Amino acid sequence: KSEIAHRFNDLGEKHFKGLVLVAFSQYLQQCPFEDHVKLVNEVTEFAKKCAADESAENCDKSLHTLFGDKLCTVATLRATYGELADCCEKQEPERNECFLTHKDDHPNLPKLKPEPDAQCAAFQEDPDKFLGKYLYEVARRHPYFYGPELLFHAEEYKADFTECCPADDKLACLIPKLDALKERILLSSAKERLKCSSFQNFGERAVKAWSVARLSQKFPKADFAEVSKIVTDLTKVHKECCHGDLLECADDRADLAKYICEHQDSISGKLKACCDKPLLQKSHCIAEVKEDDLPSDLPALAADFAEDKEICKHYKDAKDVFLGTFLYEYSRRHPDYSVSLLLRIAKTYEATLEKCCAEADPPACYRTVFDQFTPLVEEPKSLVKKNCDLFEEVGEYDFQNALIVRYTKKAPQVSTPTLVEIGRTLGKVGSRCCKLPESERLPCSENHLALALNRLCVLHEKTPVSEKITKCCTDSLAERRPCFSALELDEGYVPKEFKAETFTFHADICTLPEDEKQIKKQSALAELVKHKPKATKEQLKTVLGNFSAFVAKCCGAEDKEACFAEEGPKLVASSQLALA
Protein backbone atom coordinates (compact mmCIF):
# COMPACT_ATOMS: atom_id res chain seq x y z
CA LYS A 1 0.00 0.00 0.00
CA SER A 2 2.91 2.39 0.96
CA GLU A 3 6.36 1.46 -0.52
CA ILE A 4 8.25 4.03 1.69
CA ALA A 5 6.58 2.55 4.85
CA HIS A 6 7.47 -1.09 3.84
CA ARG A 7 11.18 -0.14 3.25
CA PHE A 8 11.32 1.93 6.52
CA ASN A 9 9.70 -1.01 8.45
CA ASP A 10 12.06 -3.64 6.84
CA LEU A 11 15.38 -1.67 7.03
CA GLY A 12 14.87 0.39 10.26
CA GLU A 13 15.43 4.20 10.63
CA LYS A 14 19.30 4.19 10.74
CA HIS A 15 19.91 1.94 7.63
CA PHE A 16 16.96 3.72 5.85
CA LYS A 17 18.57 7.17 6.56
CA GLY A 18 22.06 5.85 5.56
CA LEU A 19 20.79 4.50 2.18
CA VAL A 20 18.64 7.62 1.35
CA LEU A 21 21.70 9.88 2.10
CA VAL A 22 23.94 7.68 -0.17
CA ALA A 23 21.28 7.64 -2.99
CA PHE A 24 20.97 11.49 -2.82
CA SER A 25 24.81 11.96 -2.68
CA GLN A 26 25.21 9.64 -5.76
CA TYR A 27 22.35 11.30 -7.78
CA LEU A 28 23.23 14.87 -6.55
CA GLN A 29 27.09 14.90 -6.49
CA GLN A 30 27.97 18.70 -6.46
CA CYS A 31 25.44 19.89 -3.75
CA PRO A 32 26.82 20.46 -0.19
CA PHE A 33 26.16 18.17 2.84
CA GLU A 34 23.57 20.05 5.02
CA ASP A 35 21.24 20.38 1.92
CA HIS A 36 21.32 16.51 1.65
CA VAL A 37 20.88 15.96 5.47
CA LYS A 38 17.67 18.13 5.44
CA LEU A 39 16.16 16.17 2.46
CA VAL A 40 17.04 12.85 4.28
CA ASN A 41 15.44 13.99 7.61
CA GLU A 42 12.32 15.37 5.76
CA VAL A 43 11.91 12.09 3.71
CA THR A 44 12.44 9.92 6.88
CA GLU A 45 9.79 12.01 8.80
CA PHE A 46 7.40 11.33 5.82
CA ALA A 47 8.32 7.57 6.01
CA LYS A 48 7.45 7.50 9.78
CA LYS A 49 4.07 9.29 9.15
CA CYS A 50 3.26 6.78 6.31
CA ALA A 51 4.39 3.79 8.51
CA ALA A 52 1.76 5.01 11.08
CA ASP A 53 -1.04 5.44 8.42
CA GLU A 54 -0.28 3.79 5.00
CA SER A 55 -3.68 4.92 3.49
CA ALA A 56 -2.75 8.64 4.09
CA GLU A 57 -2.31 11.07 1.11
CA ASN A 58 0.91 10.74 -1.05
CA CYS A 59 2.11 7.59 0.90
CA ASP A 60 0.98 5.32 -2.03
CA LYS A 61 3.30 7.23 -4.50
CA SER A 62 6.46 5.48 -5.90
CA LEU A 63 9.93 5.98 -4.25
CA HIS A 64 11.22 7.66 -7.49
CA THR A 65 8.19 10.08 -7.53
CA LEU A 66 8.66 11.00 -3.80
CA PHE A 67 12.53 11.10 -3.78
CA GLY A 68 12.73 12.73 -7.27
CA ASP A 69 10.24 15.49 -6.22
CA LYS A 70 12.51 15.90 -3.11
CA LEU A 71 15.80 16.09 -5.14
CA CYS A 72 14.11 18.67 -7.49
CA THR A 73 13.57 21.13 -4.53
CA VAL A 74 17.37 21.89 -4.85
CA ALA A 75 18.40 20.40 -8.30
CA THR A 76 16.62 23.31 -10.17
CA LEU A 77 19.65 25.60 -9.39
CA ARG A 78 21.01 25.26 -13.00
CA ALA A 79 24.23 27.17 -12.02
CA THR A 80 25.25 24.37 -9.53
CA TYR A 81 23.59 21.50 -11.57
CA GLY A 82 23.18 21.93 -15.37
CA GLU A 83 21.19 18.98 -16.85
CA LEU A 84 19.59 17.90 -13.49
CA ALA A 85 17.43 21.09 -13.85
CA ASP A 86 16.20 19.71 -17.26
CA CYS A 87 15.62 16.19 -15.69
CA CYS A 88 13.31 17.84 -13.04
CA GLU A 89 10.92 18.98 -15.89
CA LYS A 90 10.40 15.25 -16.82
CA GLN A 91 7.85 12.87 -15.14
CA GLU A 92 8.79 9.28 -14.01
CA PRO A 93 10.28 7.01 -15.12
CA GLU A 94 11.85 9.46 -17.70
CA ARG A 95 13.10 11.69 -14.79
CA ASN A 96 14.85 8.78 -12.96
CA GLU A 97 16.37 7.66 -16.33
CA CYS A 98 17.57 11.30 -16.93
CA PHE A 99 19.25 11.40 -13.44
CA LEU A 100 20.99 7.99 -14.10
CA THR A 101 22.33 9.10 -17.56
CA HIS A 102 24.06 12.22 -16.04
CA LYS A 103 25.83 10.51 -13.05
CA ASP A 104 29.49 11.79 -13.16
CA ASP A 105 32.05 8.89 -12.80
CA HIS A 106 35.05 11.34 -12.57
CA PRO A 107 33.44 14.32 -10.73
CA ASN A 108 36.98 15.72 -10.00
CA LEU A 109 36.19 16.95 -6.42
CA PRO A 110 39.03 17.97 -4.01
CA LYS A 111 40.84 14.82 -2.67
CA LEU A 112 40.10 14.56 1.12
CA LYS A 113 43.14 14.18 3.48
CA PRO A 114 42.28 13.28 7.14
CA GLU A 115 42.62 15.96 9.92
CA PRO A 116 42.99 13.50 12.87
CA ASP A 117 42.53 16.00 15.80
CA ALA A 118 39.79 18.09 14.01
CA GLN A 119 38.00 14.83 12.92
CA CYS A 120 38.23 13.10 16.39
CA ALA A 121 36.71 16.29 17.96
CA ALA A 122 33.79 16.26 15.40
CA PHE A 123 33.23 12.45 15.89
CA GLN A 124 32.85 12.87 19.71
CA GLU A 125 30.68 16.07 19.32
CA ASP A 126 28.16 14.65 16.74
CA PRO A 127 28.95 11.05 15.61
CA ASP A 128 25.79 10.83 13.36
CA LYS A 129 26.81 14.06 11.47
CA PHE A 130 30.48 12.84 11.16
CA LEU A 131 29.57 9.31 9.83
CA GLY A 132 26.88 10.96 7.61
CA LYS A 133 29.70 13.16 6.17
CA TYR A 134 31.75 9.99 5.33
CA LEU A 135 28.82 8.26 3.48
CA TYR A 136 28.19 11.61 1.65
CA GLU A 137 31.88 12.23 0.65
CA VAL A 138 32.48 8.60 -0.57
CA ALA A 139 29.02 8.35 -2.29
CA ARG A 140 29.40 11.50 -4.51
CA ARG A 141 33.01 10.41 -5.43
CA HIS A 142 31.67 6.86 -6.26
CA PRO A 143 28.10 7.25 -7.65
CA TYR A 144 27.65 3.49 -8.48
CA PHE A 145 29.13 2.34 -5.10
CA TYR A 146 27.12 -0.66 -3.70
CA GLY A 147 24.86 1.18 -1.15
CA PRO A 148 24.75 -1.46 1.65
CA GLU A 149 28.57 -2.04 1.36
CA LEU A 150 29.14 1.76 1.93
CA LEU A 151 27.14 1.44 5.23
CA PHE A 152 29.41 -1.56 6.14
CA HIS A 153 32.59 0.53 5.38
CA ALA A 154 31.05 3.49 7.36
CA GLU A 155 30.86 1.15 10.45
CA GLU A 156 34.60 0.27 9.87
CA TYR A 157 35.27 4.09 9.65
CA LYS A 158 33.39 4.42 13.03
CA ALA A 159 35.38 1.43 14.49
CA ASP A 160 38.72 3.18 13.57
CA PHE A 161 37.90 6.62 15.15
CA THR A 162 36.27 4.87 18.20
CA GLU A 163 39.50 2.87 18.93
CA CYS A 164 42.13 5.59 18.16
CA CYS A 165 40.59 8.96 19.35
CA PRO A 166 40.85 7.86 23.06
CA ALA A 167 44.58 6.91 22.53
CA ASP A 168 47.47 9.39 23.24
CA ASP A 169 48.65 9.56 19.56
CA LYS A 170 45.57 9.87 17.26
CA LEU A 171 47.55 10.71 14.05
CA ALA A 172 49.70 7.50 13.66
CA CYS A 173 46.87 5.20 15.01
CA LEU A 174 44.41 6.47 12.30
CA ILE A 175 46.63 6.90 9.16
CA PRO A 176 47.34 3.14 8.62
CA LYS A 177 43.61 2.23 9.19
CA LEU A 178 42.19 5.08 6.97
CA ASP A 179 44.86 4.36 4.25
CA ALA A 180 43.87 0.61 4.49
CA LEU A 181 40.10 1.54 4.36
CA LYS A 182 40.75 3.84 1.31
CA GLU A 183 42.30 0.83 -0.59
CA ARG A 184 39.18 -1.32 0.24
CA ILE A 185 36.83 1.56 -0.91
CA LEU A 186 38.80 1.75 -4.24
CA LEU A 187 38.68 -2.07 -4.89
CA SER A 188 34.98 -2.35 -3.78
CA SER A 189 33.93 0.62 -6.04
CA ALA A 190 35.77 -0.96 -9.05
CA LYS A 191 34.11 -4.38 -8.32
CA GLU A 192 30.56 -2.86 -8.30
CA ARG A 193 31.24 -0.50 -11.30
CA LEU A 194 32.10 -3.55 -13.53
CA LYS A 195 28.67 -5.06 -12.56
CA CYS A 196 26.82 -1.78 -13.48
CA SER A 197 29.04 -1.45 -16.64
CA SER A 198 28.05 -5.08 -17.53
CA PHE A 199 24.29 -4.23 -17.17
CA GLN A 200 24.76 -0.93 -19.12
CA ASN A 201 26.91 -2.29 -22.04
CA PHE A 202 26.18 -6.08 -22.27
CA GLY A 203 22.89 -6.68 -20.32
CA GLU A 204 21.52 -9.23 -17.76
CA ARG A 205 22.75 -12.44 -19.57
CA ALA A 206 26.40 -11.17 -19.27
CA VAL A 207 25.95 -10.40 -15.49
CA LYS A 208 24.28 -13.84 -14.83
CA ALA A 209 27.02 -15.67 -16.86
CA TRP A 210 29.71 -13.79 -14.82
CA SER A 211 27.96 -14.71 -11.48
CA VAL A 212 27.38 -18.41 -12.48
CA ALA A 213 31.18 -18.68 -13.13
CA ARG A 214 32.25 -16.85 -9.90
CA LEU A 215 29.70 -18.51 -7.50
CA SER A 216 30.37 -22.01 -9.05
CA GLN A 217 34.10 -21.48 -8.16
CA LYS A 218 33.12 -20.23 -4.64
CA PHE A 219 30.46 -22.97 -3.97
CA PRO A 220 31.59 -26.16 -5.80
CA LYS A 221 29.61 -28.40 -3.31
CA ALA A 222 26.35 -26.61 -4.39
CA ASP A 223 24.24 -28.25 -7.20
CA PHE A 224 23.30 -26.31 -10.42
CA ALA A 225 19.77 -25.65 -8.97
CA GLU A 226 21.20 -23.76 -5.92
CA VAL A 227 23.70 -21.57 -7.93
CA SER A 228 20.91 -20.68 -10.48
CA LYS A 229 18.65 -19.62 -7.52
CA ILE A 230 21.44 -17.48 -5.88
CA VAL A 231 22.53 -15.98 -9.29
CA THR A 232 18.87 -15.05 -10.16
CA ASP A 233 18.43 -13.29 -6.73
CA LEU A 234 21.96 -11.71 -6.75
CA THR A 235 21.41 -10.36 -10.34
CA LYS A 236 18.08 -8.70 -9.25
CA VAL A 237 19.90 -7.13 -6.19
CA HIS A 238 22.75 -5.64 -8.35
CA LYS A 239 20.25 -4.66 -11.13
CA GLU A 240 18.28 -2.65 -8.47
CA CYS A 241 21.43 -1.03 -6.87
CA CYS A 242 22.91 -0.04 -10.32
CA HIS A 243 19.51 1.50 -11.35
CA GLY A 244 19.35 3.68 -8.17
CA ASP A 245 16.71 1.54 -6.33
CA LEU A 246 18.89 1.45 -3.13
CA LEU A 247 16.13 0.72 -0.50
CA GLU A 248 14.81 -2.12 -2.76
CA CYS A 249 18.44 -3.37 -3.38
CA ALA A 250 19.35 -3.36 0.38
CA ASP A 251 16.10 -5.19 1.38
CA ASP A 252 16.56 -7.95 -1.31
CA ARG A 253 20.30 -8.33 -0.39
CA ALA A 254 19.32 -8.96 3.30
CA ASP A 255 16.76 -11.58 2.06
CA LEU A 256 19.57 -13.33 0.04
CA ALA A 257 22.07 -13.27 3.00
CA LYS A 258 19.28 -14.86 5.17
CA TYR A 259 18.55 -17.60 2.55
CA ILE A 260 22.27 -18.48 2.00
CA CYS A 261 22.83 -18.73 5.83
CA GLU A 262 19.66 -20.87 6.41
CA HIS A 263 20.74 -23.25 3.53
CA GLN A 264 24.57 -23.20 4.05
CA ASP A 265 24.66 -27.08 4.35
CA SER A 266 23.84 -27.28 0.56
CA ILE A 267 26.01 -24.21 -0.43
CA SER A 268 29.40 -24.22 1.44
CA GLY A 269 31.11 -25.26 4.73
CA LYS A 270 33.00 -21.88 4.70
CA LEU A 271 29.83 -19.84 5.61
CA LYS A 272 29.56 -20.88 9.34
CA ALA A 273 31.77 -17.93 10.57
CA CYS A 274 29.98 -15.40 8.23
CA CYS A 275 26.42 -16.37 9.33
CA ASP A 276 26.90 -15.53 13.10
CA LYS A 277 27.28 -11.74 12.34
CA PRO A 278 24.96 -8.68 12.20
CA LEU A 279 23.21 -7.86 8.85
CA LEU A 280 25.88 -5.66 7.09
CA GLN A 281 28.90 -7.77 8.32
CA LYS A 282 27.07 -11.06 7.38
CA SER A 283 26.34 -9.93 3.74
CA HIS A 284 29.96 -8.59 3.39
CA CYS A 285 31.51 -11.86 4.76
CA ILE A 286 29.45 -13.99 2.24
CA ALA A 287 30.44 -11.63 -0.66
CA GLU A 288 34.18 -12.15 0.25
CA VAL A 289 33.98 -15.84 1.49
CA LYS A 290 36.95 -18.01 0.28
CA GLU A 291 36.38 -20.90 -2.21
CA ASP A 292 35.13 -24.20 -0.64
CA ASP A 293 37.19 -27.46 -0.96
CA LEU A 294 36.59 -29.38 -4.26
CA PRO A 295 33.99 -32.18 -3.87
CA SER A 296 35.37 -35.75 -4.46
CA ASP A 297 32.46 -36.60 -6.88
CA LEU A 298 33.15 -33.96 -9.62
CA PRO A 299 32.07 -35.56 -12.94
CA ALA A 300 34.02 -36.23 -16.19
CA LEU A 301 33.08 -33.29 -18.52
CA ALA A 302 34.59 -34.76 -21.77
CA ALA A 303 32.04 -37.67 -21.77
CA ASP A 304 29.06 -35.27 -21.17
CA PHE A 305 30.13 -32.21 -23.30
CA ALA A 306 32.44 -33.60 -26.09
CA GLU A 307 31.66 -37.38 -26.57
CA ASP A 308 27.81 -37.59 -26.15
CA LYS A 309 26.50 -38.30 -29.72
CA GLU A 310 23.24 -36.23 -29.35
CA ILE A 311 24.69 -32.98 -27.75
CA CYS A 312 23.26 -30.85 -30.66
CA LYS A 313 19.68 -31.96 -29.70
CA HIS A 314 20.33 -31.12 -25.99
CA TYR A 315 21.75 -27.67 -27.06
CA LYS A 316 18.82 -26.78 -29.44
CA ASP A 317 16.23 -27.93 -26.78
CA ALA A 318 17.49 -25.32 -24.22
CA LYS A 319 20.71 -23.42 -25.21
CA ASP A 320 21.27 -21.10 -22.16
CA VAL A 321 20.37 -24.07 -19.80
CA PHE A 322 22.93 -26.43 -21.50
CA LEU A 323 25.60 -23.62 -21.69
CA GLY A 324 24.83 -22.55 -18.07
CA THR A 325 25.35 -26.22 -17.01
CA PHE A 326 28.72 -26.38 -18.90
CA LEU A 327 29.83 -23.02 -17.33
CA TYR A 328 28.71 -24.28 -13.84
CA GLU A 329 30.58 -27.64 -14.26
CA TYR A 330 33.77 -26.16 -15.88
CA SER A 331 33.85 -23.27 -13.29
CA ARG A 332 33.48 -25.67 -10.26
CA ARG A 333 36.57 -27.74 -11.22
CA HIS A 334 38.75 -24.70 -12.21
CA PRO A 335 39.01 -22.42 -9.12
CA ASP A 336 42.56 -21.51 -10.40
CA TYR A 337 41.05 -19.76 -13.52
CA SER A 338 39.91 -16.08 -13.81
CA VAL A 339 36.15 -15.40 -14.43
CA SER A 340 36.87 -13.74 -17.86
CA LEU A 341 38.90 -16.90 -18.88
CA LEU A 342 35.92 -19.16 -17.89
CA LEU A 343 33.51 -16.93 -19.94
CA ARG A 344 35.98 -17.00 -22.93
CA ILE A 345 36.05 -20.88 -22.72
CA ALA A 346 32.19 -21.00 -22.43
CA LYS A 347 31.95 -18.60 -25.47
CA THR A 348 34.38 -20.90 -27.44
CA TYR A 349 32.25 -23.98 -26.48
CA GLU A 350 29.04 -22.16 -27.66
CA ALA A 351 30.80 -21.07 -30.93
CA THR A 352 31.95 -24.72 -31.63
CA LEU A 353 28.39 -26.20 -31.13
CA GLU A 354 26.91 -23.29 -33.21
CA LYS A 355 29.31 -24.21 -36.11
CA CYS A 356 29.31 -28.05 -35.63
CA CYS A 357 25.47 -28.52 -35.30
CA ALA A 358 25.09 -26.81 -38.76
CA GLU A 359 27.58 -29.34 -40.35
CA ALA A 360 26.96 -32.83 -41.93
CA ASP A 361 28.51 -34.93 -39.05
CA PRO A 362 28.34 -32.95 -35.74
CA PRO A 363 30.00 -35.40 -33.23
CA ALA A 364 33.22 -35.64 -35.39
CA CYS A 365 33.25 -31.77 -35.46
CA TYR A 366 32.87 -31.08 -31.64
CA ARG A 367 34.87 -34.22 -30.54
CA THR A 368 38.00 -31.97 -30.10
CA VAL A 369 36.19 -28.91 -28.53
CA PHE A 370 38.12 -29.19 -25.17
CA ASP A 371 41.49 -28.97 -27.10
CA GLN A 372 40.40 -25.44 -28.28
CA PHE A 373 40.52 -24.36 -24.55
CA THR A 374 44.28 -25.26 -24.17
CA PRO A 375 45.61 -22.12 -25.98
CA LEU A 376 43.03 -19.88 -24.14
CA VAL A 377 44.39 -21.13 -20.72
CA GLU A 378 48.14 -20.81 -21.68
CA GLU A 379 47.81 -17.10 -22.77
CA PRO A 380 47.00 -15.56 -19.31
CA LYS A 381 49.28 -18.14 -17.50
CA SER A 382 52.26 -16.82 -19.61
CA LEU A 383 51.33 -13.12 -18.96
CA VAL A 384 51.11 -13.60 -15.13
CA LYS A 385 54.45 -15.56 -15.09
CA LYS A 386 56.13 -12.85 -17.29
CA ASN A 387 54.78 -9.94 -15.13
CA CYS A 388 55.50 -11.73 -11.76
CA ASP A 389 59.07 -12.72 -12.90
CA LEU A 390 59.67 -9.00 -13.79
CA PHE A 391 58.03 -7.67 -10.53
CA GLU A 392 60.11 -10.04 -8.27
CA GLU A 393 63.30 -8.90 -10.16
CA VAL A 394 62.88 -5.05 -10.26
CA GLY A 395 60.21 -4.39 -7.53
CA GLU A 396 57.02 -2.23 -7.59
CA TYR A 397 58.42 1.18 -8.79
CA ASP A 398 60.36 -0.14 -11.87
CA PHE A 399 57.48 -2.63 -12.59
CA GLN A 400 55.04 0.36 -12.69
CA ASN A 401 57.59 2.15 -14.98
CA ALA A 402 57.69 -0.92 -17.34
CA LEU A 403 53.82 -0.91 -17.50
CA ILE A 404 53.67 2.93 -18.07
CA VAL A 405 56.11 2.43 -21.05
CA ARG A 406 54.20 -0.70 -22.28
CA TYR A 407 50.80 1.13 -22.11
CA THR A 408 51.95 4.60 -23.42
CA LYS A 409 53.43 2.77 -26.50
CA LYS A 410 50.01 1.02 -27.05
CA ALA A 411 47.77 4.12 -26.48
CA PRO A 412 49.86 7.36 -26.59
CA GLN A 413 46.65 9.45 -27.28
CA VAL A 414 45.54 8.72 -23.61
CA SER A 415 46.25 11.49 -20.99
CA THR A 416 49.53 11.31 -18.94
CA PRO A 417 47.67 11.27 -15.55
CA THR A 418 45.46 8.32 -16.76
CA LEU A 419 48.47 6.36 -18.21
CA VAL A 420 50.41 6.90 -14.89
CA GLU A 421 47.30 5.87 -12.82
CA ILE A 422 46.77 2.54 -14.77
CA GLY A 423 50.55 1.76 -14.64
CA ARG A 424 50.60 2.45 -10.84
CA THR A 425 47.27 0.56 -10.21
CA LEU A 426 48.34 -2.60 -12.18
CA GLY A 427 51.82 -2.27 -10.55
CA LYS A 428 50.14 -2.69 -7.10
CA VAL A 429 48.11 -5.69 -8.49
CA GLY A 430 51.52 -7.36 -9.18
CA SER A 431 52.75 -6.73 -5.58
CA ARG A 432 49.46 -8.11 -4.10
CA CYS A 433 48.97 -11.14 -6.45
CA CYS A 434 52.59 -12.31 -7.24
CA LYS A 435 53.22 -12.93 -3.45
CA LEU A 436 50.19 -15.37 -3.27
CA PRO A 437 50.31 -19.18 -3.78
CA GLU A 438 50.93 -19.99 -7.51
CA SER A 439 47.31 -21.31 -7.97
CA GLU A 440 45.76 -17.99 -6.66
CA ARG A 441 48.05 -15.68 -8.80
CA LEU A 442 46.07 -15.96 -12.11
CA PRO A 443 42.57 -15.31 -10.63
CA CYS A 444 43.95 -12.44 -8.41
CA SER A 445 45.94 -10.85 -11.35
CA GLU A 446 43.33 -11.20 -14.16
CA ASN A 447 40.23 -10.52 -11.93
CA HIS A 448 41.91 -7.24 -10.71
CA LEU A 449 43.07 -6.50 -14.34
CA ALA A 450 39.36 -6.76 -15.46
CA LEU A 451 38.46 -4.06 -12.81
CA ALA A 452 41.34 -1.76 -14.00
CA LEU A 453 40.36 -2.18 -17.72
CA ASN A 454 36.66 -1.41 -16.88
CA ARG A 455 37.72 1.77 -14.93
CA LEU A 456 39.77 2.84 -18.04
CA CYS A 457 36.72 2.12 -20.33
CA VAL A 458 34.38 4.18 -18.01
CA LEU A 459 36.90 7.12 -17.99
CA HIS A 460 37.20 6.78 -21.84
CA GLU A 461 33.35 7.02 -22.22
CA LYS A 462 33.58 10.46 -20.47
CA THR A 463 36.78 11.60 -22.36
CA PRO A 464 37.31 9.68 -25.67
CA VAL A 465 40.86 9.98 -27.22
CA SER A 466 41.56 6.63 -29.05
CA GLU A 467 39.42 4.57 -31.54
CA LYS A 468 41.42 1.42 -30.49
CA ILE A 469 40.36 1.84 -26.78
CA THR A 470 36.63 2.21 -27.79
CA LYS A 471 36.95 -1.03 -29.89
CA CYS A 472 38.35 -3.08 -26.91
CA CYS A 473 35.81 -1.53 -24.43
CA THR A 474 32.63 -2.11 -26.56
CA ASP A 475 33.49 -5.73 -27.64
CA SER A 476 32.55 -8.64 -25.26
CA LEU A 477 33.69 -8.69 -21.56
CA ALA A 478 35.37 -12.10 -22.28
CA GLU A 479 37.45 -10.74 -25.26
CA ARG A 480 38.26 -7.37 -23.50
CA ARG A 481 41.71 -8.41 -22.07
CA PRO A 482 42.78 -10.21 -25.32
CA CYS A 483 41.82 -7.00 -27.28
CA PHE A 484 43.88 -4.78 -24.88
CA SER A 485 46.82 -7.30 -25.01
CA ALA A 486 46.65 -7.20 -28.88
CA LEU A 487 46.87 -3.32 -28.92
CA GLU A 488 50.19 -2.17 -30.53
CA LEU A 489 51.85 1.23 -31.35
CA ASP A 490 50.08 2.93 -34.35
CA GLU A 491 52.24 2.53 -37.55
CA GLY A 492 51.18 6.13 -38.49
CA TYR A 493 51.26 7.72 -34.96
CA VAL A 494 52.67 11.33 -35.02
CA PRO A 495 55.11 11.83 -32.07
CA LYS A 496 53.90 14.54 -29.58
CA GLU A 497 55.86 17.83 -30.18
CA PHE A 498 58.88 18.26 -27.81
CA LYS A 499 58.27 20.81 -24.97
CA ALA A 500 61.34 21.46 -22.70
CA GLU A 501 59.00 22.68 -19.84
CA THR A 502 57.37 19.16 -19.69
CA PHE A 503 60.77 17.55 -18.72
CA THR A 504 62.03 20.59 -16.69
CA PHE A 505 62.03 19.88 -12.88
CA HIS A 506 62.08 22.68 -10.22
CA ALA A 507 62.67 22.76 -6.39
CA ASP A 508 58.83 22.39 -5.87
CA ILE A 509 59.31 18.54 -6.26
CA CYS A 510 61.47 18.43 -3.03
CA THR A 511 58.29 19.43 -1.03
CA LEU A 512 56.28 16.39 -2.26
CA PRO A 513 56.29 13.05 -0.34
CA GLU A 514 57.84 9.89 -1.95
CA ASP A 515 54.66 8.60 -3.76
CA GLU A 516 54.01 12.15 -5.18
CA LYS A 517 57.72 12.49 -6.27
CA GLN A 518 57.38 9.09 -8.08
CA ILE A 519 54.15 10.28 -9.86
CA LYS A 520 56.01 13.44 -11.12
CA LYS A 521 58.91 11.30 -12.55
CA GLN A 522 56.49 8.59 -13.90
CA SER A 523 54.54 11.47 -15.63
CA ALA A 524 57.85 12.61 -17.27
CA LEU A 525 58.43 8.91 -18.29
CA ALA A 526 55.04 8.77 -20.16
CA GLU A 527 55.86 12.15 -21.87
CA LEU A 528 59.32 10.74 -22.92
CA VAL A 529 57.49 7.84 -24.72
CA LYS A 530 54.82 10.15 -26.33
CA HIS A 531 57.71 12.17 -27.96
CA LYS A 532 59.94 9.07 -28.64
CA PRO A 533 57.52 6.12 -29.06
CA LYS A 534 60.21 3.89 -30.75
CA ALA A 535 62.60 4.43 -27.74
CA THR A 536 63.59 1.03 -26.15
CA LYS A 537 62.65 0.15 -22.50
CA GLU A 538 66.38 0.23 -21.44
CA GLN A 539 66.94 3.69 -23.10
CA LEU A 540 63.90 5.05 -21.14
CA LYS A 541 65.04 3.23 -17.92
CA THR A 542 68.52 4.92 -18.22
CA VAL A 543 67.05 8.44 -18.90
CA LEU A 544 64.59 8.13 -15.93
CA GLY A 545 67.55 6.92 -13.76
CA ASN A 546 69.46 10.14 -14.75
CA PHE A 547 66.34 12.29 -13.89
CA SER A 548 65.99 10.42 -10.50
CA ALA A 549 69.70 11.09 -9.62
CA PHE A 550 69.33 14.79 -10.68
CA VAL A 551 66.19 15.24 -8.42
CA ALA A 552 67.95 13.43 -5.47
CA LYS A 553 71.15 15.58 -5.83
CA CYS A 554 69.41 19.02 -6.12
CA CYS A 555 66.81 18.26 -3.34
CA GLY A 556 69.88 17.38 -1.14
CA ALA A 557 71.74 20.61 -2.15
CA GLU A 558 72.39 23.72 0.06
CA ASP A 559 70.91 25.97 -2.74
CA LYS A 560 68.15 23.81 -4.35
CA GLU A 561 66.85 26.19 -7.12
CA ALA A 562 70.45 27.07 -8.25
CA CYS A 563 71.10 23.27 -8.69
CA PHE A 564 67.83 22.70 -10.70
CA ALA A 565 68.46 25.95 -12.73
CA GLU A 566 72.05 24.85 -13.72
CA GLU A 567 71.74 21.01 -14.04
CA GLY A 568 68.09 20.77 -15.28
CA PRO A 569 68.54 22.20 -18.84
CA LYS A 570 71.68 19.99 -19.45
CA LEU A 571 69.74 16.75 -18.64
CA VAL A 572 66.68 17.86 -20.75
CA ALA A 573 69.06 18.49 -23.75
CA SER A 574 71.07 15.20 -23.37
CA SER A 575 67.83 13.14 -22.76
CA GLN A 576 66.53 13.88 -26.34
CA LEU A 577 69.79 12.43 -27.85
CA ALA A 578 69.55 9.29 -25.60
CA LEU A 579 66.04 8.33 -26.95
CA ALA A 580 66.70 8.80 -30.75
Ligand SMILES: CC(C)Cc1ccc([C@H](C)C(=O)O)cc1
Ligand atom coordinates in the same frame (compact mmCIF):
# COMPACT_ATOMS: atom_id res chain seq x y z
C1 LIG B 1 26.48 4.55 10.60
C2 LIG B 1 25.89 4.14 9.26
C3 LIG B 1 26.18 2.68 8.99
C4 LIG B 1 24.39 4.38 9.24
C5 LIG B 1 23.93 5.83 9.15
C6 LIG B 1 22.60 6.09 8.93
C7 LIG B 1 22.12 7.38 8.86
C8 LIG B 1 22.96 8.46 9.01
C9 LIG B 1 22.40 9.88 8.92
C10 LIG B 1 23.13 10.74 7.90
C11 LIG B 1 22.44 10.54 10.30
O1 LIG B 1 22.44 9.80 11.30
O2 LIG B 1 22.45 11.78 10.37
C12 LIG B 1 24.31 8.21 9.24
C13 LIG B 1 24.79 6.91 9.31
Ligand SMILES: CC(C)Cc1ccc([C@H](C)C(=O)O)cc1
Ligand atom coordinates in the same frame (compact mmCIF):
# COMPACT_ATOMS: atom_id res chain seq x y z
C1 LIG C 1 45.62 1.90 -22.25
C2 LIG C 1 45.99 0.44 -22.39
C3 LIG C 1 47.46 0.32 -22.79
C4 LIG C 1 45.68 -0.34 -21.11
C5 LIG C 1 46.13 -1.79 -21.07
C6 LIG C 1 46.33 -2.52 -22.23
C7 LIG C 1 46.75 -3.84 -22.18
C8 LIG C 1 46.95 -4.48 -20.97
C9 LIG C 1 47.40 -5.94 -20.93
C10 LIG C 1 46.59 -6.81 -19.98
C11 LIG C 1 48.90 -6.02 -20.57
O1 LIG C 1 49.23 -5.81 -19.39
O2 LIG C 1 49.70 -6.30 -21.48
C12 LIG C 1 46.74 -3.75 -19.80
C13 LIG C 1 46.33 -2.43 -19.86
